């Protein structure tokens, strides 16, 4: 019985009053553990206060702010029902990645690849979760292309934290280098992230989620260039005095979403401010070129599968109404391309949809740009977005998004045949 | 501007797309295509060279720093 | 109903009242000297070889110093 | 003299108010050496301000 956590999930992703601070808090972290550990009491209050003033549940928009919340906030910081909600969510994910592969028939590798990586592509490393934070550990049969050529040379990536690394910030908008977090994602977490951004979120949003990127380099330098941060101790005359201290953009955000009666507003702003050094980069879209496995490479050996994925980005569900001038949407997939969100953010998208009002549909008919309209080279084609348009918001819909990803290989054939499926 | 034709009087048409071609463009369509065509549109290398001259000066300062030991 | 003209070898489209011919000549002479799209490839390979030899200088300054 | 370069990179690039200066701020006085050995990007004020932001953010940690 996982109906209550999924009901909370559906009512918290379709709610158009998402805390827009919690959108930007993901691009401050990228799932980095030490980045997340300094925001511990901040996200603790941001869970319990925001839940008890508004019944929707927080941080459903980002995958990394679920697993790390479920493991690093298990020290009794929260009341246990919210912990049981997040633990039920990750238990649903573990359940459906058990159901994706065949546990009674998966033993031993086969031609340097696991047996489970042929039966369902959810276990295949070549499939990528469309909002990727780290790099996968397996990068053998894939090519990762930023501008023209694959960056299979492993020497156009490096990054360090807290060492005053100015030229990567100066080249943040650039595209030929990218700066990874120097932590590969393990294949279990790769599978789980693939499930969360390929099955759970689109079936529980009914293709109404969207992906945007925050132009965050200019966003921090007019958010945290107040002298209350630059001159800080290693006041509180009035609350408006602290408002004038931290400025107006912050008190439009953190007026209630982290304001506790114990810790005041300025201390919460400093608590958020204490992890700017895990800044990351600007959002860039990344091409994943993947030839098929040798189980499928018997047919069409010249085929090269395109997979457009998102790096350092944020999968949102609402329009950020306060960050309208430092944000840019990125519809790229048949999932996560919702034109209501993009029209509320962008302007020319809104002109394009009020010119062609038939394109307001959610079932993949919304025209992606020419970099992204390669329908005959993706791994998720039009019947997936067709099915996840009219899907019910039940857990069986999540599991039938999962098990609609069995491969067509002869190995996949004999595997799902021998279990009498 | 406008064209200058040989035959004086105009001729009506009856043809198909599979027969001979004809320019039949409504005015708002050509206007919108002109808008879409209008809206769709180093010395930093010398800067790098001169900064590399400054790196050369920094390097010869390092050479003058190292030989004194 | 439709009215048109049958094509010929003696029908002539004139110059566009020389108000667009002059910007055609401007676009002609503003691009006589500029990006030739020839040394852009030389620029790419020179930048890449320069990055390669500079990283080689990094390996040399990291190991020969010991 | 390093004073002209320090006042240039503080008053024109970084744009600080006058009440915070290089004596009361140790982290700025340390990172001025690293800023002064970089000559470009003095149109790019935002990256340098963000570097000062991340240095004062990494400074005031209990770890």
């Amino acid at each position: 019985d996982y109906e209550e956590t999924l009901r909370l999930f559906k009512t918290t992703v379709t709610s158009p009053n998402y805390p827009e601070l919690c959108y930007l808090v993901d691009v401050l972290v990228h799932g980095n553990v030490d980045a997340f550990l300094l925001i511990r009491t901040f996200v603790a209050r941001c869970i319990v206060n925001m839940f008890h003033t508004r019944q929707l549940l927080v941080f459903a928009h980002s995958y990394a702010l679920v697993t790390l919340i479920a493991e690093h906030l298990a020290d009794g910081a929260l009341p246990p029902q919210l912990l049981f909600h997040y633990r039920n969510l990750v238990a649903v994910l573990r359940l459906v990645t058990r159901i994706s592969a065949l546990p009674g028939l998966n033993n031993g590798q086969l031609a340097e690849e696991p047996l489970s990586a042929y039966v369902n592509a959810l276990h295949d490393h070549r499939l990528w979760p469309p909002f990727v934070t780290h790099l996968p550990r397996n990068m053998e049969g894939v090519q990762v292309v930023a501008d023209r050529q694959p960056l299979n040379p492993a020497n156009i990536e490096a990054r360090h934290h807290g060492v005053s690394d100015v030229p990567r910030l100066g080249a943040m908008d650039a595209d030929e280098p990218l700066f990874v977090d120097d932590y590969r994602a393990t294949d279990d977490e790769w599978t789980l992230q693939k499930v969360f951004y390929l099955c759970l979120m689109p079936a529980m949003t009914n293709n109404r989620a969207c992906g945007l990127g925050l132009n965050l380099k200019t966003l921090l330098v007019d958010l945290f260039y107040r002298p209350a941060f630059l001159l800080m101790p290693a006041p509180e005359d009035s609350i408006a005095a602290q408002r004038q201290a931290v400025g107006e953009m912050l008190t439009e955000l953190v007026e209630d979403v982290a304001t506790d009666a114990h810790t005041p507003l300025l201390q919460a702003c400093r608590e958020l401010f204490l992890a700017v050094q895990f800044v990351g980069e600007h959002v860039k879209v990344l091409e994943v070129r993947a030839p098929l496995d040798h189980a499928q490479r018997q047919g069409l050996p010249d085929f090269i599968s395109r997979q457009h994925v998102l790096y350092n980005g944020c999968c949102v569900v609402t329009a950020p109404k306060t960050l309208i001038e430092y944000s840019l949407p990125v519809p790229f997939h048949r999932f996560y391309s919702n034109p209501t969100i993009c029209a509320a953010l962008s302007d020319d998208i809104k002109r394009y949809v009020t010119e062609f009002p038939h394109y307001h549909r959610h079932d993949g008919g919304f025209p992606l740009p020419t970099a992204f309209a390669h329908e005959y080279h993706n791994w998720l084609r039009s019947p997936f977005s067709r099915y996840s348009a009219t899907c019910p918001n039940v857990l069986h819909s999540v599991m039938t998004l999962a098990a609609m990803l069995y491969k067509i290989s002869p190995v996949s054939l004999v595997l799902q045949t021998k279990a009498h499926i | 501007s406008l064209l200058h034709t040989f035959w004086r009087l105009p001729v009506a048409v009856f043809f198909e797309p599979h027969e001979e071609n004809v320019l039949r463009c409504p005015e708002r369509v050509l206007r919108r295509l002109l808008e879409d065509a209008a809206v769709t549109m180093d010395r930093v290398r010398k800067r790098y060279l001169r900064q590399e001259l400054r790196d050369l000066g920094h390097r010869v300062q390092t050479y003058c720093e190292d030989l004194e030991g | 109903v439709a009215v048109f003209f049958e094509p010929h070898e003696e029908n002539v489209l004139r110059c566009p009242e020389r108000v667009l011919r002059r910007l055609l000549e401007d676009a002609a002479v503003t691009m006589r000297g500029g990006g030739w799209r020839e040394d852009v490839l030389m620029d790419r390979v020179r930048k890449r070889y320069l990055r390669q030899e500079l990283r080689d200088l990094g390996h040399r300054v990291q190991t020969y110093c010991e | 003299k390093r004073d002209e370069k320090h006042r240039h990179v503080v008053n024109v690039v970084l744009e600080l108010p006058t009440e915070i200066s290089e004596a009361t701020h140790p982290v700025l006085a340390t990172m001025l050496s690293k800023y002064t050995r970089m000559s470009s990007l003095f149109n790019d004020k935002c990256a340098f301000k963000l570097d000062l932001l991340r240095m004062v953010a990494v400074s005031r940690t209990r770890r």
């Binding site: 030229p167 990567r168 100066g170 080249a171 030929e176 280098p177 | 790098y48 900064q51 790196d55 390097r59 390092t62 720093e65 190292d66 | 930048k47 990055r51 500079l54 990283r55 200088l57 990094g58 300054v61 990291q62 110093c65 010991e66 | 050995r37 970089m38 470009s40 990007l41």
Partner: peptide, 20 residues
């Protein structure tokens, strides 16, 4: 005694991020 060359090892990848 040998960080003095690590300084130029830092600055060359600095200007690799800058110039490229």
């Amino acid at each position: 005694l040998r960080q003095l060359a690590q300084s130029v090892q830092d600055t060359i990848q600095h200007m690799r991020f800058l110039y490229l």
